[PDB]
Write a protein that binds this ligand. Sequence first.
Ligand SMILES: Nc1nc2c(ncn2[C@@H]2O[C@H](COP(=O)(O)OP(=O)(O)O)[C@@H](O)[C@H]2O)c(=O)[nH]1
Ligand SMILES: [Mg+2]
Length: 172
Amino acid sequence: GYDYDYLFKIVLIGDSGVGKSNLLSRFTTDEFNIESKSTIGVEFATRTIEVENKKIKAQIWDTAGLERYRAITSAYYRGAVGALIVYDISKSSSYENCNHWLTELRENADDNVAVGLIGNKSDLAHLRAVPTDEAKNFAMENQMLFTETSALNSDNVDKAFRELIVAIFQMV
Ligand SMILES: Nc1nc2c(ncn2[C@@H]2O[C@H](COP(=O)(O)OP(=O)(O)O)[C@@H](O)[C@H]2O)c(=O)[nH]1
Ligand SMILES: [Mg+2]
């Protein structure tokens, strides 16, 4: 990793418990943590991927519990060129709160940010509370990419991040 052509900062946002921290770990180091306690703070991790023979350092940010800390929250969004809004396919509240997250993006992130919607925990299909076609339509109406993922079993995680990175690449 001596060099890279671009660095794309991407923020993960969404309700607590949906799997953001595990999406970060699954994508960056192929790791998953079954632990149900949220870490209060901010972190980032990187992975380099290739798009059209260009090396892109994807710098993936994750946070919890700092919403009342203004400067840190500002720093969280600062410079982000992509965002993934994450809900839990088994928890309708997390999906219904996606409009809040879109609004947070509009109010805190740069105008040009490329956005993907992720319905995580697809392995909990027996507990599904959000129909795929409904969420897919909501994503389209709001100019968001859409993927259902399982951070737990890995399903579609690389796809969700890659598609967004390709989309960021086309814009810039
Ligand atoms: N079944 C299932 N559990 C998951 C998945 N992703 C995360 N979890 C679990 O859901 C809980 C919340 O995950 P976490 O990544 O901390 O969510 P966050 O609060 O959005 O950062 C933890 O117990 C995780 O192990 C998934 O895809 N499937
Ligand atoms: Mg977390």
